[PDB]
Design an enzyme around this catalytic site. Structure first.
Site, short mmCIF file in Angstrom:
data_model
loop_
_atom_site.label_atom_id
_atom_site.label_comp_id
_atom_site.label_asym_id
_atom_site.label_seq_id
_atom_site.Cartn_x
_atom_site.Cartn_y
_atom_site.Cartn_z
N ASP A 152 -4.27 -7.86 -2.54
CA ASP A 152 -4.30 -6.43 -2.72
C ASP A 152 -3.40 -5.99 -3.86
OD1 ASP A 152 -4.08 -3.52 -2.45
OD2 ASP A 152 -3.54 -3.61 -0.31
N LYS A 154 -3.36 -2.31 -6.23
CA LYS A 154 -3.94 -0.99 -6.25
C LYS A 154 -3.11 -0.09 -7.14
CE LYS A 154 -1.77 -0.02 -1.63
NZ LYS A 154 -1.39 -1.42 -1.31
N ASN A 157 0.61 0.71 -6.69
CA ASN A 157 1.51 -0.41 -6.80
C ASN A 157 1.70 -0.72 -8.26
OD1 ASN A 157 1.02 -0.58 -4.03
ND2 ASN A 157 -0.03 -2.61 -4.11
#
Ligand SMILES: NC(=O)c1cn([C@@H]2O[C@H](CO)[C@@H](O)[C@H]2O)c2ncnc(N)c12
Ligand SMILES: CC1=C(/C=C/C(C)=C/C=C/C(C)=C/C=O)C(C)(C)CCC1
Lengths: 346, 324
Positions: A152, A154, A157
């Site tokens: 992950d 995104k 972030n």
């Protein structure tokens, strides 16, 4: 009102900056409410430098059993320091939460910036998105060189500072697996920021990171992810179906190069997904999109995107803006929990 | 002195009706009227009706969102509890008694009732003080090695109780006495005499200095600083129209906050001080119910000021009231 008072304390901290324990850092308004605890800006009382303090509340940690994810984020950030991965400055605990105190990225996060640019602006201009995407790629590459699959990734972030250089953060969503054991079944990451492989509980490698990169760029330009429009807020099962099956409509807002890049990544199959071919991290780099990117300048963090955050312009949420998640209903910690909390602290 | 002295009472109305002996069990009609009791009862009813929902909301809103259950909210919960002490110690008792036309729980009852009412009001007083301190420390940044973390929060809460007990407990051990105040259907503090035999004089001095003057200084200091800080901040961040309006509004609010402390405790302080500095007064007995009205209303206005005008609580409250 009181929210403005909190904003005033933030302004005060910024002014000082421009010119353990959590008692050795003066604490200001939150910048978001993480999965675990508050994440507020703070300033060293003895140094006069701003740091973000990602607090992970002990109660919330026990509820989700998020002990593994915390330890991962610590060890990775502790080891990896560059101009595309945030430096870690301190890792201590209080009696209520575990703290990672990391170097500032005062300019706010890319996710914020989708809406902060102007809500009537339909995402970033193509060059500006391309620049940030390129910077994300160098950060991903550095992880891959240490043999870390991030899973992950995104927008939230990917953080902006006031130099107009971005860095990835929140590396607790990763797994470190050396090459020749990268492949292994698993489900990890937050839904709608996951790759097909992960959802089906199948083997994965660096490929998934390139899927996430695609999702990120798509969201930069269209002001929406692929797996949700702007009327979608559908449950996990439908969201899973979007990730697995769909190759979405690609706006003409895109440049032909950026359009093409998005098309390749949001087409299913890692083999047909840029980057992974034989498992290249420079498979991305062959796309015509990167004709505007010089690798030497990229590696030195000298890329300048349109719109660079100012230090007299505040980026941060109000202090009482919270998400709220399970805290104890009369529930008392196990010995094991306490042992993880001490172990984390250093 | 201008009332009626007694070895266990001080009626602030002169003796000339011959029934000014023992206002504990004497029907009050020699310094009050039935209509005044209806108005007294009305006022006490009001204070319950507003005060109880308001304080319930303060506790309630934190329970519906997990993240609100945190150290920095502890003092707000304490404030609501303090206020509830005033409701059940003061307001309810006075409502019951007023309709009989005199205080019906007797001398022992007077000591109890007076204790709970005083205790309530004093925890409230010290909450407001602590709150101003906390705001000053956190925002203006003047002191080092302080935070509003769990340990600090608990200390802060504990402190308001300790200071309150330090005032409410002395008249029970004969350092002062509880005796009817107002229309003599509520029991207050004896401060009308410097009556040595019960040791009133030293207690009155202690009250005036430690529980009014000290607070008053602190309130002015803290809030002055806060207004300075917020004006300064707004000047250093002029790019939002909202923030400039807000700064002016916050300054206005701060004046209201200071004024609200004044209204609550100044009447008691004023009256007590005047009789001490110059013996005798032309103060009535209905006049002595006036300070009680002002003081009691702080159970309503303190959470309105300090809770309602913050964004998070507002959202949650609106959601629940509009079906939730
Ligand atoms: N963990 C980190 O490295 C950071 C998290 N935030 C903010 O805290 C929010 C999460 O609650 C993010 O979306 C950012 O706004 C940060 N803000 C500034 N600098 C940082 N290094 C971080
Ligand atoms: C006597 C006195 C004070 C306190 C009075 C109190 C605490 C009265 C409470 C009345 C209630 C709770 C009625 C209902 C002050 C302000 C400290 C100043 C000095 C004189």
């Amino acid at each position: 009102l009181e929210t403005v008072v909190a904003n005033s304390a933030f302004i005060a901290a910024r002014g000082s900056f421009d010119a353990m324990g959590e008692d050795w850092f003066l604490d200001f308004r939150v910048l978001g409410r993480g999965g675990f605890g508050e994440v507020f800006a703070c300033q060293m009382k003895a140094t006069g430098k701003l740091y973000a303090c990602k607090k992970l509340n002990k109660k919330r940690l026990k509820k989700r059993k998020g002990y593994q994810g915390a330890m991962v984020e610590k060890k990775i950030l502790a080891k990896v320091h560059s101009r595309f991965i945030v430096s870690l400055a301190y890792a201590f605990e209080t009696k209520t939460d575990l703290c990672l105190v990391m170097t500032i990225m005062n300019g706010g996060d890319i996710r914020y910036h989708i809406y902060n640019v102007d809500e009537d602006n339909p995402g970033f201009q193509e060059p500006r998105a391309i620049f940030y995407t390129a910077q994300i790629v160098s950060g991903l590459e550095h992880l891959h060189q240490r043999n870390i699959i991030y899973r992950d990734l995104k927008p939230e972030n990917v953080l902006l500072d006031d130099d107009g250089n971005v860095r990835i953060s929140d590396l607790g969503l990763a797994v470190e697996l050396k090459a020749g054991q990268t492949k292994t079944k698993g489900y990890a990451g937050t839904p709608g920021f996951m790759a097909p492989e992960l959802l089906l509980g199948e083997e994965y490698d660096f490929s998934v990171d390139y899927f996430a990169l695609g999702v990120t760029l798509y969201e930069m330009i269209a002001a929406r992810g692929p797996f949700r429009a702007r009327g979608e807020k559908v449950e996990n099962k439908e969201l899973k179906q979007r990730v697995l099956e769909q190759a979405v409509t690609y706006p003409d807002k895109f440049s032909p190069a950026s359009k093409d890049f998005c098309e390749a990544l949001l087409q299913k199959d890692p083999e047909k997904r840029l980057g992974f071919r034989d498992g290249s991290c420079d498979g991305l780099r062959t796309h015509p999109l990167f004709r505007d990117i010089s690798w030497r300048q990229l590696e030195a963090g000298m890329l300048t995107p349109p719109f660079v955050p100012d230090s007299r312009t505040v980026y941060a949420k109000n202090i009482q803006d919270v998400g709220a998640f399970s805290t104890v209903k009369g529930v008392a910690f196990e010995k094991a929990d306490t042992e993880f909390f001490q172990e984390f602290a250093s | 002195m201008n009332g009626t002295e007694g070895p266990n009472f001080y009626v602030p109305f002169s003796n000339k009706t011959g029934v000014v002996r023992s206002p504990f069990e004497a029907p009050q009609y020699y310094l009050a009227e039935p209509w005044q009791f209806s108005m007294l009862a009305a006022y006490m009813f009001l204070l319950i009706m507003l005060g109880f929902p308001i304080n319930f909301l303060t506790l309630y809103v934190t329970v519906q969102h997990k993240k609100l259950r945190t150290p920095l909210n502890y003092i707000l919960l304490n404030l609501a509890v303090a206020d509830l002490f005033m409701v059940f110690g003061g307001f309810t008792t006075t409502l019951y008694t007023s309709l009989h036309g005199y205080f019906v729980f007797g001398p022992t009852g007077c000591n109890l009732e007076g204790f709970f009412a005083t205790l309530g009001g004093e925890i409230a007083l010290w909450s407001l003080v602590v709150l101003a301190i906390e705001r000053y420390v956190v925002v203006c940044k003047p002191m080092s090695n302080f935070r509003f973390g769990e340990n600090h929060a608990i200390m802060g809460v504990a402190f308001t109780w300790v200071m309150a007990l330090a005032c409410a407990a002395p008249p029970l051990v004969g350092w002062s006495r509880y005796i009817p105040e107002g229309m003599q259907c509520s029991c207050g503090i004896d401060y009308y005499t410097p009556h040595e035999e019960t040791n009133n004089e030293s207690f009155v001095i202690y009250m005036f200095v430690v529980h009014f003057i000290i607070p008053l200084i602190v309130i002015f200091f803290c809030y002055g600083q806060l207004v300075f800080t917020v004006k300064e901040a707004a000047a250093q961040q002029q790019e939002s129209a909202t923030t400039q309006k807000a700064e002016k509004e916050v300054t206005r609010m701060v004046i209201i906050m200071v004024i609200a402390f004044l209204i609550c405790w100044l009447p008691y302080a004023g009256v007590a001080f005047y009789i001490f500095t110059h013996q005798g007064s032309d103060f009535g007995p209905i006049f002595m119910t006036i300070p009680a009205f002002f003081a009691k209303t702080s159970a309503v206005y303190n959470p309105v000021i300090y809770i309602m005008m913050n964004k998070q609580f507002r959202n949650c409250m609106v959601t629940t009231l509009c079906c939730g």
